[PDB]
Structures are given as structure tokens and as C-alpha cells.
Design a protein around this nucleic acid. Sequence first.
RNA 1: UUUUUUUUUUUUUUUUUUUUUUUUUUCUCCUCUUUUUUUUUUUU
Length: 70
Amino acid sequence: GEIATILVENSISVIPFSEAQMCEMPVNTPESPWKVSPEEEQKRKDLRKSHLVFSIDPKGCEDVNDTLSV
RNA sequence: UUUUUUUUUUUUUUUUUUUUUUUUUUCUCCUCUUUUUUUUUUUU
């Protein structure tokens, strides 16, 4: 009840989305997961082999932003 | 040696109809005390 009060009062929504607002989703299905269409591999410039990328990240970091490489 | 007569289960069937959830009261009302209100910054 207290958490709910803090939400309602401070103007924050707790409603999951609707069908048409969900459905426009990237299909990360097991029968066909995501993988890059090769024309975009052309158009971009890969570095997954010739350079090292890693990250330190806070405990519990289910979603990383920060990365660097020198 | 004991004849003859004294009716019985109401008659009738071939009549029209154009609405509609509910329904009807109760008054004015003293919110107590460190504050201006804090604020960049970075790791989600």
C-alpha cells in the first residue's frame, strides 16, 4: 500500500502495455531469433575480431549501457 | 291358499384487446511547530 501510494502520488505509471503497443516487437523467438541481415553488415563496420570490448558493471546490472576500448 | 302398479344421470359454445429499466430528501464541519524549499556530479 505504501509503495502504491508513492507511485500514484509522484505521477508514475504501473500499467503494462496493450496488444498493438506490444505486438510491434522484435521477434526473439527460439525457432527464429535475431541475427543481422548481411546488407547491414556491409553498411556498418564490424569490430568483433580485431578489438577487445568488455565492461565493469554494478551488481545486478541486467542491462548494460557503458562500454569502452583502448 | 298372499295378486296389480309406482319414467330418469343440466341444455349451450365457432370470444376482441394497439406496452417497456427506474420511481421520492437529511445541515454547517480548527489537518499542531528546524526551515528557506534541496537540486551539479558518476556508476542502473
